[PDB]
Amino acid sequence: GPLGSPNSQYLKTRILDIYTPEQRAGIEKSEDWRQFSRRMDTHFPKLMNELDSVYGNNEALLPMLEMLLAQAWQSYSQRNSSLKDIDIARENNPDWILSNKQVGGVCYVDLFAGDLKGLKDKIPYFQELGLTYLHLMPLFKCPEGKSDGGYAVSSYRDVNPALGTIGDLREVIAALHEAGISAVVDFIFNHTSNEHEWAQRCAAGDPLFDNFYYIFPDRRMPDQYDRTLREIFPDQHPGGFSQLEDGRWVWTTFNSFQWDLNYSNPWVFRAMAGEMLFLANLGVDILRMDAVAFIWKQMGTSCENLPQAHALIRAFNAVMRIAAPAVFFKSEAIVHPDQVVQYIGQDECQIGYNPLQMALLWNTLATREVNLLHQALTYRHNLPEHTAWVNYVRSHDDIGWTFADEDAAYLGISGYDHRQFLNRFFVNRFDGSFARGVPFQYNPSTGDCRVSGTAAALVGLAQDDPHAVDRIKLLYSIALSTGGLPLIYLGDEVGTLNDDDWSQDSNKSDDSRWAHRPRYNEALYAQRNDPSTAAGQIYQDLRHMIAVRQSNPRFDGGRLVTFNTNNKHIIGYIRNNALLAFGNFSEYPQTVTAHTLQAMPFKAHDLIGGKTVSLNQDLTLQPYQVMWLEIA
Numbered sequence: 001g002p003l004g005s006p007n008s009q010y011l012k013t014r015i016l017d018i019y020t021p022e023q024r025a026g027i028e029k030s031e032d033w034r035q036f037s038r039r040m041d042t043h044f045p046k047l048m049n050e051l052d053s054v055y056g057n058n059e060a061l062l063p064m065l066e067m068l069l070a071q072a073w074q075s076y077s078q079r080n081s082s083l084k085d086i087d088i089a090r091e092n093n094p095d096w097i098l099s100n101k102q103v104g105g106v107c108y109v110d111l112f113a114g115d116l117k118g119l120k121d122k123i124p125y126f127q128e129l130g131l132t133y134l135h136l137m138p139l140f141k142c143p144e145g146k147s148d149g150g151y152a153v154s155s156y157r158d159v160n161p162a163l164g165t166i167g168d169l170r171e172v173i174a175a176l177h178e179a180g181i182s183a184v185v186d187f188i189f190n191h192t193s194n195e196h197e198w199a200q201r202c203a204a205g206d207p208l209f210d211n212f213y214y215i216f217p218d219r220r221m222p223d224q225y226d227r228t229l230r231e232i233f234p235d236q237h238p239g240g241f242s243q244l245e246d247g248r249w250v251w252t253t254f255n256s257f258q259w260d261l262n263y264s265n266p267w268v269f270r271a272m273a274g275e276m277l278f279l280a281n282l283g284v285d286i287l288r289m290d291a292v293a294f295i296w297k298q299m300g301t302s303c304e305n306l307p308q309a310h311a312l313i314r315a316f317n318a319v320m321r322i323a324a325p326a327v328f329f330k331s332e333a334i335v336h337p338d339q340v341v342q343y344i345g346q347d348e349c350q351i352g353y354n355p356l357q358m359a360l361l362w363n364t365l366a367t368r369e370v371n372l373l374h375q376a377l378t379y380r381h382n383l384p385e386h387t388a389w390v391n392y393v394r395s396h397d398d399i400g401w402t403f404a405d406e407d408a409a410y411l412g413i414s415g416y417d418h419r420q421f422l423n424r425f426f427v428n429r430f431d432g433s434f435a436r437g438v439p440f441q442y443n444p445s446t447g448d449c450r451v452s453g454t455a456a457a458l459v460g461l462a463q464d465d466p467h468a469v470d471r472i473k474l475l476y477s478i479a480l481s482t483g484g485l486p487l488i489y490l491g492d493e494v495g496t497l498n499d500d501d502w503s504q505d506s507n508k509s510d511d512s513r514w515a516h517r518p519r520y521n522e523a524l525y526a527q528r529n530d531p532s533t534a535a536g537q538i539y540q541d542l543r544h545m546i547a548v549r550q551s552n553p554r555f556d557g558g559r560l561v562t563f564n565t566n567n568k569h570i571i572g573y574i575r576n577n578a579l580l581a582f583g584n585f586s587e588y589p590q591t592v593t594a595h596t597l598q599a600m601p602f603k604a605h606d607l608i609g610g611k612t613v614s615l616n617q618d619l620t621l622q623p624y625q626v627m628w629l630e631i632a
């Protein structure tokens with residue numbers, strides 16, 4: 001703007017006004033201030049541009065921003081020197097996320113290890129597995145009873161006391177860092193629980209919390225909005241709103257006890273940015289940006305993926321570039337693939353879940369046909385510089401069939417009919433199916449349904465299907481080798497089956513996702529080194545692929561080129577022009593012809609099986625065989 005308007009230099013002089021002139025002189029000369037000052041200059045114009053694009057000439061914008069930047073300085077000043085070293089290192093190495101060295105795991109602290117002290121005791125296991133990244137499921141205070149598995153947050157600062165204290169969390173994070181492991185946690189920034197102090201105060205009409213949520217007097221606007229809102233948990237409530245005891249209606253995209261925060265209020269942004277800086281200074285390395293798609297609402301639209309949602313995330317990003325450069329964002333957007341990828345950017349979310357690949361791994365097991373998977377790896381895999389996918393096989397959530405109908409239509413596939421088939425297959429309602437999953441949120445108004453169940457349940461391990469172990473290794477091979485940071489759902493690496501206690505526990509019984517949230521299975525973990533057990537076969541074969549990925553630089557980076565196998569059952573792709581991966585999605589042997597392989601060297605070492613493979617004749621793969629062939 002013109003002479004007189006706000007800019008980094010203006011804002012910095014006002015930050016320093018809290019100091020006596022004597023104190024100020026010292027602050028300005030300090031190392032912390034020089035670093036803060038240079039990052040302000042570099043990144044503040046982005047923060048201002050993004051916020052201006054959202055809030056425009058809102059009276060509260062300048063006061064809120066000065067408040068937030070004063071907080072950003074106090075936060076960076078307090079930030080521990082070991083974390084400032086990580087800041088400098090990541091500032092100098094934006095592609096750390098793209099290294100083949102990275103392998104992630106995720107677990108619930110309570111289910112996997114009891115409590116935070118118990119989790120700290122599991123760290124030698126994480127090292128034995130090879131993890132360099134560990135996502136811990138929501139850790140903070142939440143409603144007793146039903147809390148959407150911790151996702152209805154009653155406090156961003158107080159640890160759930162069943163898990164331990166903030167001090168225990170601090171020690172865990174430092175212990176993870178000592179072991180070479182990044183700490184990853186959720187930033188549940190779209191909504192709080194209805195017991196959160198802000199929600200109570202907002203609903204009670206406390207002016208300090210005016211417009212922190214979206215509360216309406218009656219159904220007039222909810223009915224209007226509901227004309228275009230998708231139902232995420234239709235078993236819980238219709239549309240996007242829930243009714244308070246006093247008769248008013250509040251926006252609740254998810255459960256009725258999760259109230260969507262009102263980002264059209266710039267004081268909400270500032271509030272959440274303060275919570276973000278608190279997590280940063282715990283030493284968190286990556287924040288999982290929960291429900292990114294939903295943070296802006298607009299009548300007559302889906303209220304998903306709106307331009308302002310992307311702008312607010314880029315504003316949050318610039319706050320981290322200024323006050324905690326180590327802290328990266330992981331986008332969790334389970335939406336149309338055209339929209340998934342728009343969250344991924346060095347200035348937005350540097351990494352994002354890849355639900356397209358994950359959904360299509362499962363699809364290809366069901367159909368035995370790699371067509372959709374091949375299409376996605378050909379046209380939707382490669383990303384902008386300085387960004388990466390998080391490739392995964394399962395998560396704490398159901399599987400949604402989030403492939404693009406337009407893509408499927410190019411292949412002669414009707415998306416609607418195909419999902420009906422996938423849904424039947426994976427819940428064991430299709431002749432011959434190996435899968436033992438359970439439905440989640442069947443919606444009779446749309447035909448939509450998703451699938452619950454662990455990786456091992458969905459491949460046939462519960463019934464001892466002789467192909468189950470090999471199916472698990474095949475799916476993980478692809479997440480481990482396509483390019484991106486792979487994420488193991490801990491428990492999968494020993495073949496953990498569903499919890500069949502869940503259906504009868506009245507705090508869980510309306511949420512079939514609890515089927516694939518079992519506790520740590522001591523008996524299976526105890527078999528992990530025994531090659532005659534399914535646990536041992538799964539664990540040693542995953543561990544072997546992790547060792548290869550992490551040691552072999554032909555896996556480095558996020559880029560791939562697909563290779564046409566000329567066999568509809570076999571997927572093929574090349575990393576770094578040097579590693580040729582084939583995966584057979586058929587339960588029968590399948591061949592890649594000598595003719596298809598003419599451009600390849602006569603012989604190549606297979607890193608999976610350890611044998612030299614001849615490529616100048618027909619290559620027959622065993623049912624569900626993976627080969628990782630060194631061609632350069």
Ligand SMILES: O=C(CO)[C@@H](O[C@H]1O[C@H](CO)[C@@H](O)[C@H](O)[C@H]1O)[C@H](O)[C@H](O)CO
Pocket residue numbers: 148151152188232254290291292293332333334335396397
């Ligand atoms: O269910 C979800 C939507 O299909 C939400 O998922 C996220 O938040 C939910 C509420 O906090 C929580 O239920 C779920 O475990 C969490 O992963 C995700 O934000 C969504 O997948 C991304 O677009």
Ligand SMILES: OC[C@H]1O[C@](O)(CO)[C@@H](O[C@H]2O[C@H](CO)[C@@H](O)[C@H](O)[C@H]2O)[C@@H]1O
Pocket residue numbers: 562563564565566595596597598599600
């Ligand atoms: O076109 C005949 C037959 O010959 C090749 O082009 C090899 O010379 C086969 O194509 C395969 O190999 C290519 C180079 O490695 C690769 O890019 C193709 O994806 C793959 O099918 C083709 O089948």
